[PDB]
Amino acid sequence: NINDRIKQVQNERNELASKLQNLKLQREAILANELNILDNLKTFLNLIKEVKTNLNILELENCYYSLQSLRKKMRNNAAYLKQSFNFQQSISTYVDTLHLELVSTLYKILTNGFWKITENSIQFTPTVEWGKDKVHIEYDTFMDFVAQQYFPKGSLDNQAWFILDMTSADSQEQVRAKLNTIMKEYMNLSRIVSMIKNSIFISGKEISYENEKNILVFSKSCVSTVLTSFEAVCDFMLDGLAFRDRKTLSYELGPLFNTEFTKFVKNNASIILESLDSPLKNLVSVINNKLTRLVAKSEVTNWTHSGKEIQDLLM
């Protein structure tokens, strides 16, 4: 319908141009002014089309910047502000839906594309071919601009233009609710955090990592098994996650890992230390060093893992 609105203004402008030339005096100077307003209005309307097109072709980053510029013009654009209450009402309603469709689209791409989370499994895929046209999207690039545009410094910015510039209160809430769920599930990985917490170091809860498909699998299932399951989580974080997400999960789970791994080993030292050399003891050693590498790779500073305490225990 933007195309139709562009067409109506073009026809008004053309009929006015003809009316003016038909005249050819202070009645001429106002029609020429009126014409320039319609010309500027045309340009304004083309920006709304730009937003829609960028959403359509999945230039999602550009769409945001297109919208940002539009909302500034809705504030200050002389041609726009010369339009009627009825006109602006219809514009606002439509632009509100564009805010909503944009963020709804990001949620879909995240929920139905990059991540596949079920009752018993977490799969991550770092690229997607999205929609009817199978547009290639890379996760790193995608989430870089998403975090930048919508969640700078990691939280929902409720006083930022993207929410604040929304016209109607109900649409604004819809945009806010969607962005909140995105922040929770995809900036903070809340479902992933809970799943890992609820299964690690629990007897009879098994965890495996399928590295080729990139799936962390939780299933119904001894000391080695608890360890191989915790190691699957470590492998998933080291080798399976994007940089951003390894950092976030290491920040959130690190202190739990340090305390829960150390106590498990201490409490099961006798079996672990039964032989001089064993696969069991080897596995404990490998996990201990994987925790060291996880702290380093994730670049967090809220926990450390020298490996020292456990390296000493195995001696």
Side-chain angles (χ1 to χ4, degrees):
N1 67 128
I2 183 60
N3 283 355
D4 294 334
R5 187 55 61 94
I6 290 167
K7 191 90 86 188
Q8 285 176 50
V9 168
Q10 285 166 335
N11 287 332
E12 214 192 321
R13 192 268 182 232
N14 300 344
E15 289 187 51
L16 178 55
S18 287
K19 203 184 80 173
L20 177 57
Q21 185 46 57
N22 281 10
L23 258 68
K24 302 174 188 164
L25 204 80
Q26 71 177 260
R27 182 42 157 73
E28 290 175 32
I30 68 168
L31 300 175
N33 178 230
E34 218 173 68
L35 204 50
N36 190 237
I37 290 159
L38 291 182
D39 286 335
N40 286 325
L41 187 66
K42 172 172 179 170
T43 297
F44 172 84
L45 286 183
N46 282 347
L47 185 46
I48 303 177
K49 172 164 177 70
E50 178 184 297
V51 177
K52 192 47 164 187
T53 300
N54 282 334
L55 186 42
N56 280 359
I57 67 167
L58 299 168
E59 295 276 8
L60 303 173
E61 194 183 4
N62 288 357
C63 187
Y64 177 91
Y65 292 124
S66 291
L67 264 172
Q68 193 183 344
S69 181
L70 177 61
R71 285 297 191 182
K72 196 173 169 182
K73 282 175 177 61
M74 283 166 86
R75 190 180 300 115
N76 295 128
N77 188 276
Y80 183 62
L81 294 183
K82 271 280 177 286
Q83 301 312 300
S84 67
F85 175 83
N86 186 261
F87 181 107
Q88 297 183 357
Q89 190 96 297
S90 67
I91 300 303
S92 279
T93 291
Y94 178 75
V95 179
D96 279 351
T97 77
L98 293 175
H99 281 235
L100 183 65
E101 191 191 342
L102 176 50
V103 298
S104 297
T105 300
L106 305 166
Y107 176 81
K108 289 184 193 183
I109 293 166
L110 282 164
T111 307
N112 300 129
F114 291 122
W115 297 99
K116 194 176 175 299
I117 300 174
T118 64
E119 191 189 357
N120 66 300
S121 68
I122 305 162
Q123 179 179 35
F124 175 77
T125 308
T127 64
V128 81
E129 316 301 309
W130 191 254
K132 319 181 149 292
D133 294 312
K134 299 282 156 79
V135 175
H136 190 69
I137 317 177
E138 313 216 309
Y139 180 82
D140 292 338
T141 313
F142 176 91
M143 274 311 287
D144 281 355
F145 81 76
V146 170
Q148 199 178 18
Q149 297 177 345
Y150 307 93
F151 314 103
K153 297 166 159 62
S155 53
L156 179 286
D157 198 0
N158 213 17
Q159 294 292 117
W161 76 271
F162 196 91
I163 295 155
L164 217 53
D165 292 356
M166 300 286 291
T167 307
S168 100
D170 190 83
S171 300
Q172 197 187 40
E173 176 54 44
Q174 287 179 288
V175 159
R176 190 188 286 111
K178 188 67 69 179
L179 279 167
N180 270 298
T181 63
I182 293 181
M183 180 202 67
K184 188 171 152 198
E185 300 314 344
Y186 304 116
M187 289 291 296
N188 293 338
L189 313 171
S190 46
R191 214 188 185 294
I192 295 170
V193 170
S194 79
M195 290 176 76
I196 291 168
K197 274 196 190 167
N198 286 7
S199 270
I200 64 174
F201 303 104
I202 288 95
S203 296
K205 281 185 184 196
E206 189 152 11
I207 311 164
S208 70
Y209 176 44
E210 316 186 309
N211 59 84
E212 219 61 54
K213 291 282 190 192
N214 204 32
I215 316 168
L216 193 68
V217 176
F218 301 79
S219 52
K220 306 186 165 186
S221 212
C222 93
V223 168
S224 63
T225 307
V226 164
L227 294 170
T228 54
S229 290
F230 178 63
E231 181 189 40
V233 177
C234 292
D235 293 343
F236 182 63
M237 296 175 59
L238 284 163
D239 300 323
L241 288 177
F243 182 84
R244 169 178 308 279
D245 298 315
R246 178 194 306 114
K247 178 181 259 197
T248 291
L249 279 178
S250 167
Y251 192 92
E252 285 289 335
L253 290 167
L256 180 91
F257 280 12
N258 258 353
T259 318
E260 210 155 302
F261 176 64
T262 303
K263 290 188 191 188
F264 189 78
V265 172
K266 279 187 157 302
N267 284 337
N268 294 275
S270 293
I271 205 81
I272 286 151
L273 301 183
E274 191 166 286
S275 308
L276 172 64
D277 310 311
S278 64
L280 184 58
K281 188 190 274 192
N282 287 352
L283 177 69
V284 174
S285 186
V286 163
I287 297 166
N288 189 49
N289 185 240
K290 284 176 180 183
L291 286 174
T292 298
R293 293 195 279 107
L294 183 58
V295 181
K297 214 182 176 171
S298 73
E299 299 181 20
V300 301
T301 56
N302 75 311
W303 72 294
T304 65
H305 193 95
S306 65
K308 181 84 169 174
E309 169 162 21
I310 297 299
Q311 281 165 23
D312 281 349
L313 191 51
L314 305 171
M315 172 158 294

